[PDB]
Amino acid sequence: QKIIENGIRNNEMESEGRKFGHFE
Amino acid sequence: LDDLEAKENEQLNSRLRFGEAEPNLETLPALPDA
């Protein structure tokens, strides 16, 4: 369960990291 | 042989009757690039 949930959190953070690291 | 003939002249025709031998293309040095 935690490994699924960690994968989901990391994918969500990287998906918003596209906007976060859009210009750097 | 030609060098010996040259030194022969200092103390002293069959190929001459025709022109110089056209060189072989594959044995000449490469042409420097422009």
Binding site: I4, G7, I8, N11, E12, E14, S15 | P32, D33, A34
Partner: protein
Amino acid sequence: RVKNKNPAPIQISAEQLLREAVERQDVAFVPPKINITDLEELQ
């Protein structure tokens, strides 16, 4: 005058040919990493 037959200061060498051939390669392709936002894309 495009008639400067002077021999070039640098002559094309084989190793130059192969080095400027291999420069044509780039880094490994970078694909946008797939995002798994729920259990479906995980399974």
